Amino acid sequence: MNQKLKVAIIGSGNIGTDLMIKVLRNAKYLEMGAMVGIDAASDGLARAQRMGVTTTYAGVEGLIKLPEFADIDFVFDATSASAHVQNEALLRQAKPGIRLIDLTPAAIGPYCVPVVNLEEHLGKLNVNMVTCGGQATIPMVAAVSRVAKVHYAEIVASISSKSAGPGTRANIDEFTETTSKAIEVIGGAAKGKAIIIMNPAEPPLIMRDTVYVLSAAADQAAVAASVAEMVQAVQAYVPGYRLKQQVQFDVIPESAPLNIPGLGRFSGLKTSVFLEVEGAAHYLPAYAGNLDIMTSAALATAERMAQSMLNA
Amino acid sequence: QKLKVAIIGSGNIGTDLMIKVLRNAKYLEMGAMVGIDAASDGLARAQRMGVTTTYAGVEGLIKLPEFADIDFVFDATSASAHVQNEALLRQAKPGIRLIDLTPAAIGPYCVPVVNLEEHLGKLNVNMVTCGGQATIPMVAAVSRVAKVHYAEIVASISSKSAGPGTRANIDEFTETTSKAIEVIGGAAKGKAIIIMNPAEPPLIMRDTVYVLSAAADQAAVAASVAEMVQAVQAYVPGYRLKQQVQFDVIPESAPLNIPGLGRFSGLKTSVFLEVEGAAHYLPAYAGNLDIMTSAALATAERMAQSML
Amino acid sequence: TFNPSKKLYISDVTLRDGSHAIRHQYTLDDVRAIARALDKAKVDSIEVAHGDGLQGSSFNYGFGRHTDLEYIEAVAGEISHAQIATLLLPGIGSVHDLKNAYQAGARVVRVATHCTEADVSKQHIEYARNLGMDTVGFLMMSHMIPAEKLAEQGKLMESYGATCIYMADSGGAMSMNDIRDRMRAFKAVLKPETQVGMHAHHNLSLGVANSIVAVEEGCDRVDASLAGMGAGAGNAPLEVFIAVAERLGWNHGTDLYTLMDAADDIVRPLQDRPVRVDRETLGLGYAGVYSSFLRHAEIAAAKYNLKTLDILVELGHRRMVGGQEDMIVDVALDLLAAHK
Amino acid sequence: FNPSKKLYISDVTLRDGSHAIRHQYTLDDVRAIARALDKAKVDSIEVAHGDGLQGSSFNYGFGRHTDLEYIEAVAGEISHAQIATLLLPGIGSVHDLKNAYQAGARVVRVATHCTEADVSKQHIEYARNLGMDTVGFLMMSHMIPAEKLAEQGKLMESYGATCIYMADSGGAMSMNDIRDRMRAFKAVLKPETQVGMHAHHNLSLGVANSIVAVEEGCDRVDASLAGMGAGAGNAPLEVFIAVAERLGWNHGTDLYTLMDAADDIVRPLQDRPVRVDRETLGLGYAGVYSSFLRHAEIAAAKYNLKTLDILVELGHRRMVGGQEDMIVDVALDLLAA
Ligand SMILES: NC(=O)c1ccc[n+]([C@@H]2O[C@H](COP(=O)([O-])OP(=O)(O)OC[C@H]3O[C@@H](n4cnc5c(N)ncnc54)[C@H](O)[C@@H]3O)[C@@H](O)[C@H]2O)c1
Ligand SMILES: NC(=O)c1ccc[n+]([C@@H]2O[C@H](COP(=O)([O-])OP(=O)(O)OC[C@H]3O[C@@H](n4cnc5c(N)ncnc54)[C@H](O)[C@@H]3O)[C@@H](O)[C@H]2O)c1
Ligand SMILES: O=C([O-])C(=O)[O-]
Ligand SMILES: O=C([O-])C(=O)[O-]
Ligand SMILES: [Mn+2]
Ligand SMILES: [Mn+2]
């Protein structure tokens, strides 16, 4: 609408720049206040300038000194998990009520996957967005957990090398750890695992995510319909998120259980979901749906926080 | 008293034979050593022993004065050379006795421990091959105990003991030895293999004999084999078993298929021989020379004994 | 110039790469028996982990019968000559997993990345150096980029602290001159003291040939496994490599007969799908497909009623990298749709 | 060497492969294999017992059929490749060659131990008189230095052979030994004389050694489907063709056809797997004639010895091709000790 709250984006790289284009084009309660980087030659800062957004290459101390900072209520962090710690620290001292939306896997605040728990942490001043793999796959874990008890859930995210900047490459262990924990906490799995693979093939590959869910015995039609409903729900945010294959099933009889070493001897159902995620090509081309699945999630969370503050 | 002989072919066989005639012959004595290569070592050994030599072949032999009194010719050249040597010698001296050491086999076979007395009146007698002289006595040792369906011999000799004349008659070696395994050894079907190995120090002659017979008593075959080894040792003391006779019963429920020959059961007897020579020309490893030359000499000696 | 001969470093991977051939079902008795033989044979290191490295146990790659830490502890109790090595792939295993493996007995760690992605190895290599481990960089699917580009990625791992760089022919796709090219490129840019390792696969029957050439070009370490136990048609067969090294007069320092006996008496009987070059494993080498995909593609072939070779040929066309086993079912489902 | 040069692919599945099946190929087996090889467009298909013409015997093992029966069966199924055969003086004769030509053979490889090329003269002459493609084949080529091997090759060329092969019958050579021998051959043979490689895979170098021979100018490569052949087998044909194809070599065959034939026709005929293992590695390490493998295994089972102990002692005795009878001789001597 007309009265919008201002935002800053810290990190002028792949994720930060795709997120700025989404704010500019689609945000209803928010508007760009500043784009913040540490590299004057960063493509994202050049892009921010061409689109009229105030920039700084003096990091978070630089953002805190802009005139525009007085009117910024939200900050999206798209830098790296280690930098978020210091970013939160500084911003919190400069402005106690500022809302931080963390797009790194630092996870100093609670997890949010909008189609599962958007309403949960809207009053929190630091919310974590898990990872691209998490945003793409936690909805499918939750889709199974709402039909049957889930013992173990494993996700494999494969992205084009070119879409993973240095910020992503400095937090690969945190990617696996944060994603696994969020599969448990948000997805409802008793145990989670996450794998990330980069592939430099040309033409660049579309993000693919495969989700393997081991649940108790369950009705296959019910699990498939729940998956389909969840895919429709994520598509309201990211239109190019879709199944690449029909949901696959394998029954595991109690007479021949599956041994997961040190975890258990399980029986029930194995659900395999094969997704592909096409992005809107706001910054990088359509193959990089790994940016979109995170940025659309981060923008939806801040938009709902803003909505709630402007209209109780 | 002793009758005069000529040896044609002054190679490994011919020269070894010459030394045996000189030292051991009781009824024969050297008259001439005949070759075709003036550089042949055998012609030089012959000259050192006082034996008349020629490098002009069979033609030269006849022109030799010594030829008027020569009653026996031993042919140690090569199988194709022998048909011509027989031709020219028969023309020139009708009753001359030819003892063929090549595999040409235009005369009947003689393996002394099996049939020395059989062809004493013949004017051309063939001595099979070294493999045949070493292994036909074993085939015969099995055949006097049981019917032999198939017999196969593998002769391996040092490459240095195989001169060019041997190398130029390898096909003839396998064909004549296989026919003699049947005719004299008694097998219904024979096969012969010859292998040359250049290992150094040179290898002793080895001969392996495999015999497929009807079912038989193993102790009796082994005893027959032992008696025959003793018989051959009277001529060649270095002839002996390298291993005990080995046996394999071929059950009627799983007969052997010899392609195009038939399906047989019975007994497989494997005889492993080694033949050490007297080192008369080449060293002791070359028992392949002795097994032939002692047989050739025993044949002519017996003939000469009876001529008187 | 009279100088001491070079002592080759023999790195056995029977209990790591070989885990792929048995679908990660080694028993504890198996690993103890294998490690005892290797240790008696005096190999330099015994690599132990799931085939996809630490924390590779998963639906994607297959679950292990035991955990990596249980296998490491079992091996540590049987040996006294060889060091325990382990494999860690960023994106699958973490520095926390490396800490636990060091606690269990691992002293050598090979940090493996796809050949173009060495910059994700920084934290793992630096951590391993801080732990005092023999820290090695390992570049997977080394046929996918030219020799000079591969060397640049190797030099990056060297800058992080690795003191040995391996090239792994994960798809078993290279021939001898490709090995020469890569060894020369590494030697041209690495410090002279940095060691170089070869990790060949046997899919084109050149596992031992490529290792021989690597050594003739100066490589210091050779990975191999008993009976070739390993992914695809296997790794270079250790007993075969040592027999050849012995005939060449090379200083390998192992006991050949101990290895030959262990290969056929202990390791070979554990195989349930023979580790050899055949239509399927030759297809991996021809297409240049990550060798661990073999059994997963044979399983998909039987589930979906397709030919394994057709699955591998398509995976080759898709240019997949290590770890992408989930794309095997994707290819199988797409082949079924295509055929309809 | 030019990659566009057409390679001559000589399959030996029905001759050297006879050793792996103990000379028990059925007639339908040889028709099926020959049909697939001919469809694949290999240049020649070799047919005989493992020890060549008239190899059937107690020493080497009796065939299920005679050589001429196999040749006749193969002749009836093919139209592109030529039928090749193998003849070892001391085992087969010119008479046997004549019969093989009348049954359909057009290429004859006259094989001798590497130091005994002079026994091949009459066979080579006879083959040239029939107008056959006449080839000298030197067995156990690791046993003497390259220069000496090339001298024996030159002798066979002088008798009339137009192609000279080196056969690594013990599967004991590595890649530089192949380069040394290729260079020595090329230094002394006439430029027109063809050179052929016959590698064994006992050290896992069957394909590697064949690749190096071609890089060094060799014209003909012997290989067999699935490596079916003595010892750990010959160079595996489908593998050599896959490598040649990846290298862009003009091998002139159909890879897919070969790969399917190797596993769907040939491999299922094996009883003792044709692979590199303790026993076949022992052959290559000790440099023992590869066809001794199943005979050594038979003797080991009879006398309760380790096959490897028999093969290592055979290596010390320096036996040559055809000396299977010394296998039992060694077994008995090991039990005596
Ligand atoms: N698919 C993806 O690329 C992806 C998806 C989801 C989440 N993420 C996460 O998003 C974060 C960014 O990833 P990326 O791929 O866009 O990395 P990137 O390297 O492209 O971008 C990081 C940006 O932050 C800047 N930066 C670093 N420190 C800074 C500081 N103190 N202040 C301001 N700017 C600073 C860098 O210069 C760069 O412009 C990472 O934590 C990554 O894990 C990435
Ligand atoms: N162990 C053996 O070497 C052996 C054993 C038994 C029988 N034989 C047979 O003995 C014969 C000789 O074999 P070798 O090894 O002694 O060969 P060799 O080459 O050493 O001897 C042949 C001799 O005959 C000479 N010669 C060739 N043609 C001649 C001719 N037309 N007239 C006169 N002299 C001629 C040669 O110059 C040589 O002096 C061959 O037929 C061989 O098959 C050989
Ligand atoms: O890691 C593996 O073992 C490799 O890539 O081949
Ligand atoms: O004849 C052959 O087959 C050999 O020598 O390798
Ligand atoms: Mn590997
Ligand atoms: Mn061969």
Side-chain angles (χ1 to χ4, degrees):
Chain A
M1 58 193 166
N2 182 251
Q3 284 157 342
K4 291 176 180 171
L5 302 177
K6 300 190 180 180
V7 310
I9 292 168
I10 306 193
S12 59
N14 290 333
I15 286 282
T17 312
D18 186 82
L19 173 67
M20 183 177 72
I21 297 158
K22 286 170 165 63
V23 168
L24 288 168
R25 297 175 57 80
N26 296 140
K28 284 172 167 87
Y29 305 89
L30 299 172
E31 72 189 350
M32 287 306 302
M35 161 70 89
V36 179
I38 44 86
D39 176 15
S42 173
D43 187 72
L45 296 187
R47 184 58 169 273
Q49 292 160 186
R50 290 191 293 263
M51 309 190 130
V53 178
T54 297
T55 63
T56 181
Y57 51 96
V60 70
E61 293 211 71
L63 168 64
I64 289 167
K65 293 187 180 177
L66 287 164
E68 293 83 348
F69 189 67
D71 300 339
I72 285 165
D73 291 320
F74 288 82
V75 181
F76 292 100
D77 193 334
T79 57
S80 203
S82 310
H84 187 62
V85 179
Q86 324 179 0
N87 289 343
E88 159 63 38
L90 251 35
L91 285 163
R92 194 53 61 199
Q93 304 177 8
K95 188 164 190 176
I98 196 148
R99 302 281 181 141
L100 195 62
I101 300 296
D102 178 17
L103 284 78
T104 81
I108 49 188
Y111 313 120
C112 178
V113 175
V115 292
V116 181
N117 75 332
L118 177 61
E119 301 297 309
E120 192 173 6
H121 302 295
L122 301 163
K124 303 291 199 328
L125 303 185
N126 186 123
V127 166
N128 181 73
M129 303 311 297
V130 194
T131 61
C132 64
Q135 295 295 335
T137 65
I138 290 166
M140 302 294 97
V141 179
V144 184
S145 302
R146 73 191 179 175
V147 175
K149 169 189 197 184
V150 170
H151 302 293
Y152 173 73
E154 183 181 303
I155 72 92
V156 187
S158 300
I159 60 169
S160 62
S161 293
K162 276 183 169 167
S163 77
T168 294
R169 297 159 178 277
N171 62 208
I172 299 286
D173 282 3
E174 294 89 350
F175 176 103
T176 65
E177 293 156 0
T178 288
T179 306
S180 295
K181 285 183 235 127
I183 282 162
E184 292 156 8
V185 178
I186 303 311
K191 174 74 182 175
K193 183 174 183 58
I195 290 162
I196 165 160
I197 302 291
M198 282 155 199
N199 184 326
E202 288 279 340
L205 300 177
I206 189 170
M207 164 189 222
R208 295 301 298 273
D209 301 88
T210 301
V211 185
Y212 298 118
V213 186
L214 175 60
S215 66
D219 184 88
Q220 294 173 28
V223 171
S226 174
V227 164
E229 186 288 334
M230 188 66 80
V231 169
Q232 191 179 54
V234 179
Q235 285 171 343
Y237 297 109
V238 178
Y241 175 91
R242 51 178 173 264
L243 291 177
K244 160 71 202 291
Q245 303 297 344
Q246 300 285 4
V247 179
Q248 302 297 297
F249 294 104
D250 297 277
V251 169
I252 300 166
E254 178 58 22
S255 67
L258 177 68
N259 174 241
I260 300 182
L263 191 68
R265 286 180 189 208
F266 297 103
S267 66
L269 183 59
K270 175 194 183 177
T271 295
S272 300
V273 186
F274 288 88
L275 295 157
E276 57 185 4
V277 190
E278 175 179 346
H282 287 332
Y283 186 50
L284 297 193
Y287 66 80
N290 41 124
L291 307 180
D292 298 59
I293 200 67
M294 169 55 83
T295 59
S296 290
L299 185 49
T301 299
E303 282 266 273
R304 181 71 189 109
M305 282 170 175
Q307 185 179 48
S308 69
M309 294 172 309
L310 295 149
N311 296 116
Chain B
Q1 194 184 352
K2 45 211 243 182
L3 305 175
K4 293 207 160 43
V5 317
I7 296 165
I8 318 178
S10 56
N12 298 329
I13 288 288
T15 310
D16 183 82
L17 171 64
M18 180 206 289
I19 302 297
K20 289 175 167 59
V21 170
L22 297 168
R23 301 210 190 171
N24 296 157
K26 174 186 209 309
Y27 304 114
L28 300 165
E29 65 172 30
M30 288 300 311
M33 166 67 90
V34 180
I36 46 161
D37 177 3
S40 48
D41 188 62
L43 292 180
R45 184 68 162 256
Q47 292 154 186
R48 193 188 332 180
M49 289 292 95
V51 175
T52 290
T53 63
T54 180
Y55 50 78
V58 60
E59 304 83 3
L61 163 50
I62 292 145
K63 292 172 187 150
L64 272 172
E66 283 85 355
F67 194 72
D69 293 318
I70 272 162
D71 295 322
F72 285 83
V73 175
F74 298 89
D75 194 335
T77 54
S78 202
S80 51
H82 181 64
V83 163
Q84 318 191 340
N85 296 345
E86 158 78 23
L88 297 165
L89 292 155
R90 187 70 43 209
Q91 185 178 65
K93 195 167 205 179
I96 198 153
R97 282 164 182 273
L98 257 66
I99 303 303
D100 184 18
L101 287 73
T102 85
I106 55 165
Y109 303 125
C110 177
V111 175
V113 293
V114 183
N115 70 336
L116 181 50
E117 298 299 312
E118 190 175 7
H119 302 124
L120 292 183
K122 277 81 175 191
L123 301 183
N124 184 308
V125 170
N126 176 267
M127 309 302 307
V128 197
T129 63
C130 68
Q133 291 300 329
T135 64
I136 294 168
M138 299 297 93
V139 179
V142 182
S143 64
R144 64 186 173 192
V145 179
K147 168 176 217 180
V148 168
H149 302 299
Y150 174 78
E152 165 188 319
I153 75 92
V154 184
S156 54
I157 59 179
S158 51
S159 298
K160 278 174 143 151
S161 71
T166 288
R167 290 163 180 279
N169 68 21
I170 301 291
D171 285 4
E172 291 90 344
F173 175 103
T174 66
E175 300 159 341
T176 291
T177 302
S178 67
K179 287 173 175 174
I181 280 166
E182 296 169 18
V183 172
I184 306 299
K189 176 68 183 179
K191 177 168 185 67
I193 294 157
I194 177 173
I195 290 146
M196 278 155 200
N197 184 322
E200 290 284 342
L203 297 176
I204 189 170
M205 178 191 211
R206 295 293 306 272
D207 301 273
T208 303
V209 186
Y210 296 119
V211 183
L212 174 30
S213 67
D217 187 89
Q218 303 174 20
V221 174
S224 181
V225 165
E227 193 277 331
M228 190 73 75
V229 168
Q230 181 178 271
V232 180
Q233 279 176 352
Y235 295 103
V236 177
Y239 180 90
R240 52 173 174 264
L241 297 174
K242 158 69 202 286
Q243 306 296 343
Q244 299 296 159
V245 177
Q246 306 297 114
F247 295 104
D248 298 283
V249 175
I250 306 160
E252 206 186 332
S253 85
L256 319 179
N257 174 63
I258 305 176
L261 191 69
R263 188 168 73 150
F264 307 89
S265 71
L267 178 68
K268 174 190 174 177
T269 297
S270 301
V271 184
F272 297 82
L273 292 161
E274 59 179 1
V275 186
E276 176 182 346
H280 288 145
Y281 179 58
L282 267 48
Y285 63 86
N288 39 122
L289 304 183
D290 299 62
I291 199 64
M292 166 57 90
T293 62
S294 294
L297 181 59
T299 302
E301 280 276 81
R302 186 59 199 105
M303 280 172 187
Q305 178 174 30
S306 73
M307 290 155 58
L308 288 149
Chain C
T1 301
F2 286 103
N3 310 83
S5 70
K6 172 172 212 166
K7 163 53 151 46
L8 294 184
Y9 186 112
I10 303 301
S11 170
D12 169 276
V13 302
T14 302
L15 303 176
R16 195 282 301 168
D17 209 322
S19 186
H20 293 301
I22 190 168
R23 295 164 74 188
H24 322 288
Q25 301 304 301
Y26 282 122
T27 67
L28 302 179
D29 278 350
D30 294 337
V31 313
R32 282 175 194 127
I34 294 166
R36 286 172 178 176
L38 290 165
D39 190 60
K40 175 172 185 187
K42 298 194 184 171
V43 299
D44 295 274
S45 71
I46 297 164
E47 196 186 39
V48 186
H50 182 273
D52 280 86
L54 294 180
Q55 292 292 299
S57 179
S58 62
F59 263 127
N60 212 31
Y61 313 126
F63 296 104
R65 181 170 167 96
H66 302 279
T67 63
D68 302 318
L69 300 178
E70 288 167 336
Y71 287 129
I72 291 167
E73 285 170 303
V75 170
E78 303 304 317
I79 65 175
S80 70
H81 182 264
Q83 284 176 294
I84 292 175
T86 196
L87 185 77
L88 175 60
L89 281 59
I92 293 172
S94 61
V95 160
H96 172 255
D97 298 319
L98 183 54
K99 177 178 187 186
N100 294 331
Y102 178 90
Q103 291 176 315
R107 292 284 179 284
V108 182
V109 57
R110 291 105 73 72
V111 183
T113 66
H114 181 61
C115 56
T116 57
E117 313 297 321
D119 72 352
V120 306
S121 66
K122 181 176 171 74
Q123 291 159 17
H124 314 81
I125 287 175
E126 296 185 350
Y127 185 82
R129 278 303 295 268
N130 281 328
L131 282 172
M133 293 181 81
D134 179 26
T135 305
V136 180
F138 185 99
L139 292 160
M140 293 187 295
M141 292 284 282
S142 278
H143 74 103
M144 291 296 303
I145 62 176
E148 284 177 21
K149 295 290 192 168
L150 186 72
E152 298 303 358
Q153 300 289 301
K155 171 177 177 193
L156 181 60
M157 291 169 151
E158 181 192 67
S159 296
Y160 298 153
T163 52
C164 182
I165 303 302
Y166 273 71
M167 49 165 146
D169 188 10
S170 312
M174 291 193 296
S175 73
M176 296 86 71
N177 282 324
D178 294 340
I179 300 310
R180 287 185 182 89
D181 292 343
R182 286 163 182 70
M183 284 295 314
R184 297 169 187 187
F186 279 129
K187 302 297 299 180
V189 301
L190 295 175
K191 290 169 292 210
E193 60 272 25
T194 296
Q195 308 294 278
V196 178
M198 177 73 213
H199 177 96
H201 273 273
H202 206 46
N203 305 334
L204 297 182
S205 78
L206 300 183
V208 175
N210 284 347
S211 299
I212 291 165
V213 168
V215 174
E216 292 172 332
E217 294 291 328
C219 91
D220 307 290
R221 308 201 173 181
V222 178
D223 278 1
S225 52
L226 292 167
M229 192 72 151
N235 289 83
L238 176 63
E239 69 276 10
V240 182
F241 177 77
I242 296 297
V244 175
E246 182 72 5
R247 296 289 293 150
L248 296 171
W250 292 353
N251 179 4
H252 61 262
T254 65
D255 190 70
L256 175 58
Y257 287 128
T258 303
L259 298 171
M260 287 175 66
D261 279 347
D264 280 7
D265 290 348
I266 309 175
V267 180
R268 196 183 291 288
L270 298 175
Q271 289 176 21
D272 71 313
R273 182 294 181 209
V275 177
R276 60 183 178 203
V277 181
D278 56 29
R279 171 174 48 206
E280 289 71 41
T281 59
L282 181 59
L284 293 165
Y286 182 92
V289 173
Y290 197 85
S291 301
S292 71
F293 292 4
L294 180 68
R295 304 270 330 250
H296 295 293
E298 290 183 328
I299 282 164
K303 178 176 164 174
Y304 295 107
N305 190 25
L306 298 163
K307 288 179 189 284
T308 301
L309 187 63
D310 291 336
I311 294 173
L312 296 180
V313 171
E314 185 56 17
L315 283 158
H317 290 320
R318 298 267 298 264
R319 307 285 202 180
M320 308 277 77
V321 301
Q324 296 199 269
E325 265 72 4
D326 51 325
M327 300 289 108
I328 300 170
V329 170
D330 189 64
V331 162
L333 290 169
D334 282 355
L335 285 168
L336 279 178
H339 296 193
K340 276 183 152 142
Chain D
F1 156 71
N2 184 293
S4 324
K5 174 192 151 167
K6 184 68 169 323
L7 301 180
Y8 183 115
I9 302 306
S10 170
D11 171 274
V12 302
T13 304
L14 301 180
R15 195 282 302 169
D16 212 321
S18 189
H19 288 306
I21 186 164
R22 293 162 84 191
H23 316 109
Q24 303 304 302
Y25 279 125
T26 68
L27 298 178
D28 281 341
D29 290 342
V30 312
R31 287 170 189 126
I33 292 169
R35 264 204 290 284
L37 294 163
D38 195 57
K39 176 173 164 193
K41 304 291 188 77
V42 301
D43 295 278
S44 68
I45 297 171
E46 193 183 42
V47 187
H49 183 280
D51 276 86
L53 294 177
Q54 290 294 304
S56 173
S57 58
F58 265 129
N59 209 36
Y60 310 130
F62 297 113
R64 178 177 175 91
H65 297 277
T66 66
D67 307 309
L68 295 174
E69 286 167 343
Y70 291 123
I71 293 169
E72 192 68 45
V74 170
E77 302 304 320
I78 68 173
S79 62
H80 175 84
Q82 286 181 294
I83 291 180
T85 196
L86 184 72
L87 178 56
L88 279 65
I91 293 167
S93 66
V94 294
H95 179 68
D96 300 319
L97 179 54
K98 175 187 85 71
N99 293 330
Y101 173 84
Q102 293 174 126
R106 293 292 176 268
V107 184
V108 60
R109 299 100 70 71
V110 182
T112 71
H113 185 62
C114 59
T115 56
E116 311 306 321
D118 78 2
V119 305
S120 66
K121 184 174 197 291
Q122 285 166 28
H123 303 82
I124 288 177
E125 286 172 341
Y126 193 91
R128 281 303 296 281
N129 285 138
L130 290 169
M132 292 180 75
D133 179 31
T134 304
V135 182
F137 186 99
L138 301 154
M139 298 187 296
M140 295 280 284
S141 283
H142 81 283
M143 287 299 302
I144 60 184
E147 300 66 38
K148 297 289 177 194
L149 188 70
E151 177 170 51
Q152 297 294 303
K154 188 76 186 178
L155 276 183
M156 301 166 151
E157 179 194 69
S158 90
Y159 308 149
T162 54
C163 180
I164 299 299
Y165 274 68
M166 49 169 145
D168 189 5
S169 309
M173 297 202 284
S174 60
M175 290 90 71
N176 285 323
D177 300 333
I178 300 313
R179 303 185 166 88
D180 292 341
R181 282 165 187 68
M182 281 306 303
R183 284 169 192 186
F185 287 126
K186 296 309 295 187
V188 305
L189 298 175
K190 298 177 275 174
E192 331 86 78
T193 297
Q194 300 301 272
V195 178
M197 180 72 217
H198 176 102
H200 268 276
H201 205 41
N202 301 331
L203 296 180
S204 79
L205 308 176
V207 177
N209 285 345
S210 300
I211 291 295
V212 169
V214 172
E215 291 171 341
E216 292 289 332
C218 105
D219 309 293
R220 305 192 173 187
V221 177
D222 273 10
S224 54
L225 289 169
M228 196 68 155
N234 288 86
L237 175 61
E238 64 282 5
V239 183
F240 176 81
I241 295 302
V243 180
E245 188 154 296
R246 295 294 288 128
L247 292 178
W249 290 4
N250 187 1
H251 63 255
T253 65
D254 188 62
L255 179 58
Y256 188 76
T257 296
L258 296 172
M259 297 180 55
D260 285 346
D263 278 8
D264 292 344
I265 306 169
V266 179
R267 195 185 295 282
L269 299 176
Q270 294 175 24
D271 60 325
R272 193 280 182 220
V274 179
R275 74 178 170 199
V276 173
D277 64 25
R278 169 174 49 206
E279 287 78 37
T280 59
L281 176 59
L283 292 171
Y285 179 71
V288 173
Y289 199 83
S290 295
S291 71
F292 290 7
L293 180 72
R294 307 276 301 274
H295 296 288
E297 292 189 317
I298 291 163
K302 178 175 175 172
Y303 297 106
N304 300 321
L305 290 160
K306 289 173 156 194
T307 298
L308 187 65
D309 287 348
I310 296 167
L311 295 180
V312 170
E313 179 61 19
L314 286 162
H316 295 316
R317 301 256 175 132
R318 295 163 280 154
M319 310 278 66
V320 304
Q323 296 199 274
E324 267 76 355
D325 54 318
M326 299 297 111
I327 300 173
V328 169
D329 189 61
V330 161
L332 290 166
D333 284 355
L334 295 174
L335 289 171

